[PDB]
Structures are given as structure tokens and as C-alpha cells.
């Protein structure tokens, strides 16, 4: 009722514009965290996307997100959105189409942020995540690692950095951890995860503008690969129970799709928000 974790689970390729000056080839770049240089979505972007989804519900938007711009009533929003951090990203493999890549440092940051925010039903999650991390560190013994949790997925190749994923047959992965971190999950060092999510490895697309067969303009766009998983913390202030319940149920309904990103008409940034479950 105070702090709930939400997972984004993008269905398409996301482009959230950083709006910063460019030194390089890609004219349009995606947002990244200043400290970790990991892809992220600003709280303003999340609030805007969810507000646009709920725009037809005037009362719900007014109660949760607040007054519209250039409206004279000046109503603050009862809901505080926190920055969305990249949890899991798809990674090209050979045994399977892609792999769910979660780095040990992102797991540590998730545990730290769960402890800091005291997320709802996060005690068991923190305990089990810490057991997973401790077992991973025990197996790794300070060396770089790539750990899968399916016996079928052992020996998978991460193409970009050329590392083989081994299966630690002594570490358990609880079902709720599969539901959170993703299916076909590989755990690797942050050294490899940084390479897998830098500006040279995540997709770059060329885009054109044609005028009776004449190319008027040329530029390049970079996007976040689809099926990527991002987590953000929602602080539900002491608000109306009915509007909070309606908003939570609509967000968690599998029929909902939220567009966070730029290129809406060409299907960029459509996502499915899910809140943390028990365990």
C-alpha cells in the first residue's frame, strides 16, 4: 500500500529520447542512467505514458497524476513515479533465439533498492534473491560467469561477447524468480552486461525521408530491444482506495498495453506493466 514494484516487459522496440547533444553517428539516442550508464526511462516519461493511457478517465487522472498543464486549478499528483531501471535485456543466443540477461550488479542494485524502498511483500523476495546471489558468488569464486537454470539451455552462446553459459546444478531458481527476472534466464557479470547494452551493441536503425524518390533527409535511431524488462517503484500515497484499486487492476489486466517511447505510429514502446506478486 506504500511502495510496490512494477515490471514493464516491453512488447516492442523502445526509443525514449534523451534530448542531449550528439557527438557521433546516431542522431537519436536512448536515455541512460547517469551513474551506471544503463538504459533507463525517466519518471516523467512513465507518468506521461500512464496518464495518456488513463486520459479518458478524468477523475482517475486528476486524483492520481494531478492537474493538466496550463490548467489553473494546480492539483498535485498523489502518486509518485520512480525512475525505471533496466532489469533484464534480451541477448542473442544460438541454442535459443534470445536469452534473458540479468547481471549480478543489477541483482545487487535490485536487492538494495528493495531494502531502501521497503517494497510491498519484498522481504521474501530479498531473502531468496540474496540466497541466489550468495550461491552465485560461491560458485563463481571471483571469475567471470554465465549461469543458466535450464539443463537444456546449458552451453548457450552469447554471440556478442562469446561466452558459454554453464548450468550450476547446486543453485535453485524459485518460480517467482522466473516470473520476475524472465524466462530462459542467464546470469552474467556486469562486465559483459555493459558491453551488451552499450551504444555499439544495442540496435541502431537507419531512417529515410523521400520526396518523389529523392532522399530529403537521413538519420539514425537507436532502440531498446523488445521483450526487455525494466522495473520501477510506485509510491502510492494515502489516496482514494477506489481509484488506486481501479488503476492497479487496469494496469495488471493482461488486456492493457501502454506506449512509453517516441515512435508511436510505427509501434515503438508498447509495454505490459505488472506489479510484484507474493513470495
Amino acid at each position: 500500500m506504500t511502495t510496490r514494484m512494477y515490471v514493464i516487459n516491453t512488447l516492442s522496440n523502445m526509443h525514449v529520447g534523451s534530448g542531449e547533444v550528439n557527438y557521433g553517428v546516431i542522431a537519436n539516442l536512448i536515455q541512460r542512467d547517469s551513474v551506471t550508464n544503463l538504459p533507463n526511462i525517466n519518471s516523467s516519461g512513465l507518468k506521461g505514458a500512464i496518464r495518456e493511457y488513463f486520459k479518458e478517465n478524468e477523475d482517475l487522472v486528476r486524483e492520481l497524476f494531478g492537474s493538466a498543464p496550463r490548467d489553473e486549478k494546480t492539483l498535485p499528483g498523489k502518486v509518485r513515479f520512480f525512475e525505471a531501471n533496466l532489469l533484464s535485456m534480451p541477448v542473442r543466443s544460438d541454442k535459443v533465439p534470445f536469452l534473458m540477461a540479468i547481471s549480478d550488479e543489477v541483482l545487487q542494485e535490485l536487492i538494495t533498492k528493495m531494502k531502501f524502498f521497503n517494497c510491498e511483500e519484498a522481504t521474501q523476495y530479498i531473502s531468496h534473491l540474496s540466497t541466489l546471489l550468495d550461491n552465485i558468488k560461491t560458485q563463481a569464486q571471483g571469475t567471470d560467469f554465465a549461469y543458466v537454470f535450464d539443463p537444456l539451455l546449458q552451453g548457450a552462446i552469447i554471440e556478442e561477447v562469446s561466452i558459454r553459459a554453464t548450468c550450476p546444478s547446486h543453485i535453485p531458481l524459485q518460480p517467482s524468480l522466473k516470473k520476475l527476472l524472465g524466462d530462459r534466464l542467464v546470469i552474467l557479470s556486469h562486465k559483459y552486461f555493459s558491453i551488451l547494452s552499450d551504444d555499439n551493441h544495442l540496435p541502431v536503425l537507419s531512417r529515410n525521408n523521400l520526396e518523389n524518390g529523392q532522399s530529403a533527409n537521413l538519420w539514425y535511431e537507436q532502440v531498446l530491444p523488445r521483450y526487455s524488462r525494466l522495473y520501477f517503484m510506485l509510491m502510492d500515497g494515502n489516496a482514494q482506495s477506489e481509484y488506486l484499486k481501479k488503476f492497479r487492476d487496469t494496469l495488471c489486466t493482461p488486456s492493457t498495453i501502454i506506449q512509453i517511447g517516441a515512435n508511436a505510429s510505427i509501434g515503438y514502446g508498447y509495454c505490459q506493466i505488472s506489479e510484484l506478486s507474493p513470495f
Binding site: 571469475t143 567471470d144 560467469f145 552462446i157 562469446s162 561466452i163 558459454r164 553459459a165 554453464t166 555499439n200
Partner: protein, 136 residues
């Protein structure tokens, strides 16, 4: 396939080593065509047939076409060096012996996926590095 500067330096050293670039920075003009055609031969015929064709020394070629295979082996060996050795790494950092011909090595060691990638990148580096010299 972005330009890899380290592979370009490897290609420069290997081109000088396998007596392609003369003391004056010039090379036989036909080698340009050799490097350009090796990649197409690898792609549309197979790695082993292309290597066998370019490794042959009984050829009616205007120059020593087999020198490019030696340069390829030198670039590949240089890439095997400076490989981050760890338990998880797929890449085999084992150097190709000089007595073994390149065709035999891929025949005896049947993991072509690494060899194919290395040979393709080494050929690209070859073609890009040959342009620093005069095309006599």
C-alpha cells in the same frame, strides 16, 4: 563488421612478413584482386574450397597467390594471442602451427564457426590494410 584497428595492424605486420609489400611501399597489383575475391569465394563456395583454391602453389597466377593464405594465418594467430583466457570463453586461443597448412588445420579441427568468423574478419582487415600501399 566495423573496422578493427588492432586487426589492421596485424594485417600490416603480416603483409610485410609474408613478402608482399616491398621495401618501397609497393605490392604486385594482382594481390588486390586476390584479397577482394577471397571473401566472395568463402561466402559463395565454402571456406574449405576457397582456402584450398588460394593455398595452392601449382597455380597459373601472375604472382604468388599463396602468400595471402600465409598472411591470413598470421593475422589469425595474432588474434589468437591477446584472447582473454577464461573458463567461459568460446574462443580457442591455440596458435596454428607453421608446418600445418591452413586447409589441414580447418579439416583436422572441426569447429569452423570460430575459424569462419576469424577468416572473414582477417580478410576484411587484409583488404582495408592493402590500401595504404602503392598498387604497382
Amino acid at each position: 563488421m566495423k573496422i578493427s584497428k588492432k586487426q589492421i595492424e596485424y594485417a600490416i605486420e603480416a603483409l610485410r612478413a609474408n613478402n608482399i609489400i616491398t621495401n618501397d611501399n609497393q605490392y604486385p597489383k594482382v594481390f588486390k584482386g586476390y584479397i577482394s575475391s577471397f571473401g566472395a569465394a568463402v561466402i559463395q563456395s565454402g571456406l574449405i574450397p576457397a582456402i584450398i583454391f588460394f593455398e595452392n602453389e601449382d597455380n597459373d597466377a601472375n604472382a604468388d597467390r599463396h602468400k595471402i593464405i600465409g598472411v591470413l594465418k598470421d593475422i589469425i594467430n595474432a588474434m589468437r594471442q591477446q584472447y582473454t583466457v577464461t573458463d567461459a570463453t568460446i574462443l580457442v586461443s591455440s596458435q596454428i602451427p607453421a608446418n600445418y597448412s591452413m586447409a589441414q588445420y580447418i579439416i583436422e579441427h572441426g569447429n569452423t564457426d570460430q575459424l569462419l568468423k576469424e577468416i572473414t574478419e582477417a580478410a576484411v582487415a587484409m583488404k582495408l590494410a592493402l590500401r595504404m600501399y602503392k598498387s604497382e
